[PDB]
A paper describes a structure:
DNA polymerase from enterobacteria phage RB69 (RB69pol) has both polymerization and exonuclease activities and has been extensively studied as a model system for B-family DNA polymerases.
The N-terminal domain (NTD) of RB69pol and the part of the P/T duplex away from the active site participate in the dimerization of the two complexes. One RB69pol-P/T complex (MolA) is identified as a new closed ternary complex with dUpNpp, which was similar to many other known ternary complexes of this enzyme. Indeed, we observed that it had only a single Ca2+ ion bound at the B site but no Ca2+ ion at the A site. Similar to the classic ternary complex, the B site in MolA of this structure was coordinated by the catalytic carboxylates Asp411 and Asp623 and by the backbone carbonyl of Leu412; in turn, it binds the triphosphate moiety of incoming dNTP with α,β,γ-tridentate coordination. The other complex (MolB) is identified as a new open binary RB69pol-P/T complex in the pre-insertion state but without dUpNpp bound and with a vacant dNTP-binding pocket. In this binary complex, the P/T duplex was completely superimposable with the closed ternary complex, representing a pre-insertion complex where the nascent base pair–binding pocket was partially formed and ready for binding of the next incoming dNTP. However, the next templating base was well ordered but remained in a non-stacking geometry with the proceeding base pair. There was a conserved small cavity in the NTDs of each RB69pol that tightly bound GMP.
Residue numbers in the entry:
A (entry chain A): -1 to 897
B (entry chain B): 1 to 901
Amino acid sequence: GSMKEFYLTVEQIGDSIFERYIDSNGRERTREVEYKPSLFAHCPESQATKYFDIYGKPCTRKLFANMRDASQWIKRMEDIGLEALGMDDFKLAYLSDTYNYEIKYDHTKIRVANFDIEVTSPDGFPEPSQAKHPIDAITHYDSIDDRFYVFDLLNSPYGNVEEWSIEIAAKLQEQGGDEVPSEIIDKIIYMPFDNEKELLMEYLNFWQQKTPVILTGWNVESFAIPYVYNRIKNIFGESTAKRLSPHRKTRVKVIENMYGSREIITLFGISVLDYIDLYKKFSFTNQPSYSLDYISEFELNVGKLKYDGPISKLRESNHQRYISYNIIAVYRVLQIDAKRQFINLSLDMGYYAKIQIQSVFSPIKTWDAIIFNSLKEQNKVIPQGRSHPVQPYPGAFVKEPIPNRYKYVMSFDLTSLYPSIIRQVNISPETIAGTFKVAPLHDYINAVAERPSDVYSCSPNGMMYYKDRDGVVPTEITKVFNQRKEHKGYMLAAQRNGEIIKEALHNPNLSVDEPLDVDYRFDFSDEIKEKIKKLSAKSLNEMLFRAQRTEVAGMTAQINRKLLINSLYGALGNVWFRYYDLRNATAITTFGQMALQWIERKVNEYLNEVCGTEGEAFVLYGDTDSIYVSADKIIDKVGESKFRDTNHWVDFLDKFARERMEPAIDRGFREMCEYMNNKQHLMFMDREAIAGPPLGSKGIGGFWTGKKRYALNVWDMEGTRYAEPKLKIMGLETQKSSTPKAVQKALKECIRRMLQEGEESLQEYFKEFEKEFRQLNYISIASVSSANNIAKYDVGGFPGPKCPFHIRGILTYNRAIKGNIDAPQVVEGEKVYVLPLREGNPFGDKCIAWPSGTEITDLIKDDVLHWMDYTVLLEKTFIKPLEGFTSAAKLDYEKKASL
Amino acid sequence: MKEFYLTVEQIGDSIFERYIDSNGRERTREVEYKPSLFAHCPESQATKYFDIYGKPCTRKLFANMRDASQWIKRMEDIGLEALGMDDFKLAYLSDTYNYEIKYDHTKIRVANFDIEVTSPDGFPEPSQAKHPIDAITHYDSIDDRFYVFDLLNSPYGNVEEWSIEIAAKLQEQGGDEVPSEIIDKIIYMPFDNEKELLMEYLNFWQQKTPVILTGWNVESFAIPYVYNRIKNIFGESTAKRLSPHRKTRVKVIENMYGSREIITLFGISVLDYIDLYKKFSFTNQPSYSLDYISEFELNVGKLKYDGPISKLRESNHQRYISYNIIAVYRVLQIDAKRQFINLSLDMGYYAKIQIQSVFSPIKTWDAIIFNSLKEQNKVIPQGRSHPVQPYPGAFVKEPIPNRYKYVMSFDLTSLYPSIIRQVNISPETIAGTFKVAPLHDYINAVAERPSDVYSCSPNGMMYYKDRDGVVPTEITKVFNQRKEHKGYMLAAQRNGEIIKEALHNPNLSVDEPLDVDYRFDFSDEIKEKIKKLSAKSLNEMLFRAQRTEVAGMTAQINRKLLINSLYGALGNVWFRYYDLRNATAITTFGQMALQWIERKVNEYLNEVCGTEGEAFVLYGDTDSIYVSADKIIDKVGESKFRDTNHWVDFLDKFARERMEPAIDRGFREMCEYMNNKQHLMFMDREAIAGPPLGSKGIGGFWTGKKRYALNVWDMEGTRYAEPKLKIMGLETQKSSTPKAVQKALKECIRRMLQEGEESLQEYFKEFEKEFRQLNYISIASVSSANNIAKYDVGGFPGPKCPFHIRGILTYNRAIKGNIDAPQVVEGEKVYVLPLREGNPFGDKCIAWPSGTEITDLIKDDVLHWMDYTVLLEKTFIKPLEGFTSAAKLDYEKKASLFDMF
DNA sequence: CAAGTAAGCAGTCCGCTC
DNA sequence: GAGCGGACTGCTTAC
DNA sequence: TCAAGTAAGCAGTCCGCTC
DNA sequence: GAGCGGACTGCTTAC
Ligand SMILES: O=c1ccn([C@H]2C[C@H](O)[C@@H](COP(=O)(O)NP(=O)(O)OP(=O)(O)O)O2)c(=O)[nH]1
Ligand SMILES: Nc1nc2c(ncn2[C@@H]2O[C@H](COP(=O)(O)O)[C@@H](O)[C@H]2O)c(=O)[nH]1
Ligand SMILES: Nc1nc2c(ncn2[C@@H]2O[C@H](COP(=O)(O)O)[C@@H](O)[C@H]2O)c(=O)[nH]1
Ligand SMILES: [Ca+2]
Ligand SMILES: [Ca+2]
Ligand SMILES: [Mg+2]
């Protein structure tokens, strides 16, 4: 045929590679291949051939008859103390050999399955490890069929019920409907069942015919998959359960972390990407709850499906709603992926690197595969992975700021610093050239230490690198970095475009039209800008949605390519990385420290010079690769009173940054490259934030409380001129998932008023929030914490020594729900709401905690509401942080007592 | 006399010390000890103080100890080394006791107590102490009395008083059989209520406050249970009266699998005898129950009783209390034998540490070295951080599995301490590095000479010869002190046979014991004056003779443990003097030395026997070579010998006169090659092994590394009346192997080595026939039980569940809902039995706590559904197949008609 | 489960000042 | 006795 | 298993492979 | 289904 072939899944099972793939005729195929791998040994110079290790030292290829021999050869070589070289993960070698080209994949041919089960349980949480309760609903969406297959148990030990009606389902809540979105109604294939055996046999047969390649859902890896597997195992036997693998192989793998161990089913020939796990790695959020209800609301702004009574009883109560719920749960994940596009990101990284798609969770595995593939094309031979001891190594510099208001601020930030350092210095395992005598870092920062080398590219940690060779790490990181730049470009264009539409919405023309057909990844032409100011509110609001969805797509693509390249840096400091080397890891961080503090000096020198001052500190702060510059003296040299409005002084500072500061900064960094004799100048420092108060207001513009704790009123970020000023808040309690939701909102308004409006406005809102606090929903004002090691501090159900406050809260909960089976149980390693309790409370302790994202069981709710300590809660979560902000910013959130 | 500390603690800025004063009276003092640490100087300010690298240091006296510790952090942040003893109570001890401490154990209050706690609802967790203490027995070393506290009334029993006369009687005369030697040492005290009992004991504790506190599980059970039980009634401050500094604290003991809690009683030294036993016994026991260790050590039986322990006090309060008393006595009997308390006192006072710190070689050795360096106005380096990582260890030759008829073994003397001294290894004696040939090239002496200037190890490390290392120096002094104190012990032995040959017909007179030193051979003056003494005054002179002997032994055992301890510390990141390159210099030097002298011995024997490239060295491990003597015996004829002693004499003569000089020459060449500071690779002949002359015995066999058996006639010049089996590694040696299978396999080996294949085949039949009639405990396997919970999946085995843990889960299901049923303890050991298919327990094995009978609830069913066939095959036949395969014989003449069925 | 370090605040324990 | 600060754990950010 | 070290054996589980 | 051996965990030696 005329289609390029690409793998779907791959496994090693003994001496066979089992591959699912799409063939030249674009059909799904499977094949068992007795892969003949090759490894490599350091040979003498005379025996030379086309194969050299990364240091250029020659190797002979050793072809093996099968894979189990190769692995044995490695163990034997490890006894002799001789290095066994090459790709020891044979299915990477196979993927590499079979697909010796850039893979173009067609996602319309990749079966992506999306499923959720319901298990009615009278006696608490149905543990998937023993699946002792009937499965009474499955919904399974298939991306090739674009259908929702619904499987519905009518008869179970916990009730006989009637068929679900798609007719009822479609309707609105009011006329007994379930509000199943109408755009999936014609995509639902319903199948009822008299017994569970029939339901399960039907789903397995169905699974044989529509075998997922990508399997996803919410908590599918930890609940649904193990629960279905063991439910089928317990009824029919193990052999029948293993039909969930198209190669009939499963492992009951033990996943370990620092607080215990859990069980997961590996289905060989399937790629499980649990969406909860994609969300945690790729979303760059930290959420107080990871329930689908909660993530659905945050991402889609779509509310919970309400239901009366406990989940354990919904089926008897309203099976019609039970089944609709199951169906929408599946849809929710598809909605979330449409927005975030984590499946597309996964496929993209998994095919770029030639790895199993689930290996996108592991940057070590992704990069091992990329660097392997890269070295193999040059007939070069990767090192044996070695054992190394974990030990600390130093990281970034963070300047101690003077706690203060800062009125006018411009920030600058190095482009992809650590990847840029890797490229600039030529930092690679095989580019190490030697070392030099290390002066103190201060001496390099101030340029009074002797030039390290006239021959080699240097870091100030004393490492020297060849300028005449290209390192594999520089080469391969450059490629991913360029992708990241391309996608960031699209993101910022989408961002700029959004503000134009936002601006056009202020004066919406009352007309009837349609959205304009544009690509949001590129700055609107003057022409399109003209046609936008003649649109209706309806048409503009649809275009704003399309822009923001384009920005989110850019954000996912760019920030996760940045994670991958930053994770190659990190991989250098991870003992399990093939190319682990603390000299190279600390070459990067130590260079970074010099670069930041070097450019701090250079910017101070330059601004003293423009402002006719001496030894003034203009750089008030920086962290890792950022500087924050006080612009007060720049504004004052013009005279604040000559500016027409805010956008006038913003324009001026924008021009000053670009035309005066950027050239000075590049001069500074070119001199630093020369001092270190680096391969390429790549220390590029873009203007980010222009921040200050609205002109003529008593806003303070910004404050720092200390390291990693500040707020700026931002008018322009990285060339995006905002319709309305945006708060950039880093580190403060507004940004922390542990801070109660209502208090996040309260503190942010406190900050907005401080920066924008000033002390009197702040003092006005403080009084306001104090008044409405005790009438706020109890969940909205509860603290959140992760609960680790509940058992370490559980001493016959009471706090042991050094018991953390949130753990105390959980022990208090556990005591109060003892011998109530249907009470919701706190899960080790998950998150809890926390409330303090007034002295004299019935729970016998000073706080209580319950599972985050839930109402507290009705058994105890009323007593909790009655004994909530509102005074301590307000003091701890609101007033204490606010006192931190206001002491920093040198104003008051209240006037003290006056008779 | 001279003043010695009892206990010491840092509480903030106050050292609290209990001590004996010059009058011999127990005292306390709080002290605001002003510590001193040290910093690096430029030459200008140099004074008497130098760090171990020589470089000069300023003393920095602090007002309190907390600013010294803060200064440390200040200095750390700065990246400046802060020299000297960070453990301030050691510096104090050093300052306060600047002389060899002479201690008097009759002035040290050693208490050991045991409590009983009647409980219906299973094990009474000490962390909650939710049941009445209904018995305590508390022996005091100074009073020589057992104080019995006996609760007469409780929620579980209103019972009568305990009769010391019914106690004394024999178990036939309705008695408890309480030893007669203690009956007149018991101070009984019944109580009508527990608060009364508890208050008195707390007040009795207040007079007679333990310095050394011991017992069996006192640390993990008895102490916390007494503490918390008193807290929970009388409140915290009252419970803190168990510290004589009213300062107590709850400690978090963390291991690889979870954590427990103990009560640190500040101002008491707790040496739980279970923990002393584990550390100092160098056994591995299938159980560490008092009852099991008592049986093993003393041969004293099992304190017996009917029904559960929860219903003993009610059923037979009279036996209950006797049990409680005899429990405490058992531990005294055990310490009478092993003397671990006295050894502990000796080492602590030697090192000038808390006595409880003898548990730690790192602490003990840090203190010893600090005190010596202080004396030379030198300054210990700061504790530094090092990444936990492996380093290479001993060499072990791969043996050819075979019978080996005639074997002679040679062992290097204290190898690792000797390499440290030989190569002068210390952090401050590191001088540089060299190009490293493969180890084989150093073994074969074809590698080029590392250095002409520095003492070398072949891991590439080079050391100054022109100075003595801190570590070498210190080890040499403890070596020298061992010799010192064994001399003293033997001189006091020889002096004690004099006095006991002057007691023959003692001059009936009125004299007084001579004021003599017993650590030296009596001058002929004293020998004369000793005969003209009375019986009284001789017998006192012999009591002092023998206490000089016991003290000499205690001290030299002490020194030996320290010598063998030190290498361990050197390999541990938390050791001040830890260096990785130093660790692997020690061990790689050891590898060379063994394989060097293997080459040398092979070369010499080939020359002596007129052969070439014959392998004489069949095996070696770390510090040992085993030499095949067959060809040596064949020079003279096997037939030419009169008896076994003749050829043993012959090999003893040949080793000492021929092989040892050849070995000394070998090791001398090696010393020059590595340019070492002194030659200390000394290799004594150890075993001579073979069959009885004219027998069909095979003499010995190897199955592999760390698995062999020798019939030994002579060890280090001691000629045995009867041959002794030296068995290493084999299942006879392993605590996991059933007691009865240990004995059977040993008799199998004995017959193989001494008698031959047919004798083996005769015994095999006999043990097979008797196996099914043996007691179930005697044929049960033993295993430690770690991570039970990990593999427990709703009461059933999880993935990769180990066999013994499957056994524990079977037991748990079987005793579920029986609260009075004995529970398996996480980290403790279990008996394991396989079960025949279709058994009611629902699995293929069961496990229960070791050193116990399995609970009567299930005992009958286990006995019925025991799989004897699987048991015999796994524990006995499979290992025997290993031995006989290696030795190239068979435990059966042929396969049975049944096996060919 | 899945690359890295720097560093903030909440809370416990405990000894010190007040 | 109350309040504080240092040494610590636990959690959660910023980069 | 609070409290020195590494080398290396066997029992048993999982699993592929061969009979 | 049983047996073997390799890759692993668990345990217990030797020194
Ligand atoms: O998760 C992270 C974030 C940052 N870092 C390090 C390396 C990286 O270069 C730097 C991040 O600084 P920024 O957050 O400003 N991002 P970066 O400079 O990489 O890229 P850019 O500024 O172009 O977005 O800190 C990590 O190692 N891991
Ligand atoms: N060049 C190279 N080939 C490797 C390495 N590890 C495994 N191989 C395998 O060795 C073979 C190389 O043969 P070639 O591609 O030159 O015909 C392929 O099967 C490839 O997967 C490695 O590190 N370098
Ligand atoms: N010599 C020495 N004394 C130390 C060291 N660490 C702490 N010290 C203490 O410093 C003081 C020195 O007093 P000196 O021995 O000079 O009379 C003593 O109290 C001693 O305990 C050390 O490393 N060397
Ligand atoms: Ca940056
Ligand atoms: Ca047959
Ligand atoms: Mg027989």
